[PDB]
Amino acid sequence: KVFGRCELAAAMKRHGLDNYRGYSLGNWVCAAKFESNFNTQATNRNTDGSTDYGILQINSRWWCNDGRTPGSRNLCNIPCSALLSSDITASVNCAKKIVSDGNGMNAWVAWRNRCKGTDVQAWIRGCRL
Numbered sequence: 549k550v551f552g553r554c555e556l557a558a559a560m561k562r563h564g565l566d567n568y569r570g571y572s573l574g575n576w577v578c579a580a581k582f583e584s585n586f587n588t589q590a591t592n593r594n595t596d597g598s599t600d601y602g603i604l605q606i607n608s609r610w611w612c613n614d615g616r617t618p619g620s621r622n623l624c625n626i627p628c629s630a631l632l633s634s635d636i637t638a639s640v641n642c643a644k645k646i647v648s649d650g651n652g653m654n655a656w657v658a659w660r661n662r663c664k665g666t667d668v669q670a671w672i673r674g675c676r677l
């Protein structure tokens with residue numbers, strides 16, 4: 549599913565990401581834009597052999613099982629395919645675990661490099677929330 553900007557904003561807000569661990573909604577929308585272009589089906593291989601899955605590009609090295617990442621934790625107790633569904637619940641629930649683990653949203657390289665320190669509010673401007 550390729551989300552609209554405000555459509556994803558409203559879905560993440562419904563799932564409680566707005567101000568979760570102090571990260572305003574625009575941070576999560578910005579990160580999704582640059583991680584996945586709002587596309588739940590996005591998959592990308594990392595340098596280390598693992599793969600990133602879904603709207604927030606969650607990694608199989610630690611967070612989900614994709615059956616091909618040696619030394620893999622599955623800390624969200626989920627097949628990585630569950631992160632590709634039109635329903636973003638698994639992605640959001642797993643992301644809440646990641647962002648609660650110490651490094652906040654710096655776990656998302658695209659957030660760190662393209663959202664952090666920017667006007668993340670624009671990403672939810674114009675949305676009815």
Ligand SMILES: [Cl-]
Pocket residue numbers: 552
């Ligand atoms: Cl629209």
Ligand SMILES: [Cl-]
Pocket residue numbers: 621622623
């Ligand atoms: Cl585990």
Ligand SMILES: [Cl-]
Pocket residue numbers: 644
């Ligand atoms: Cl919660």
Ligand code: NA
Pocket residue numbers: 572573574575668669672
């Ligand atoms: Na915001």
Ligand code: NA
Pocket residue numbers: 607608609610611612613614617620621622
């Ligand atoms: Na894994």
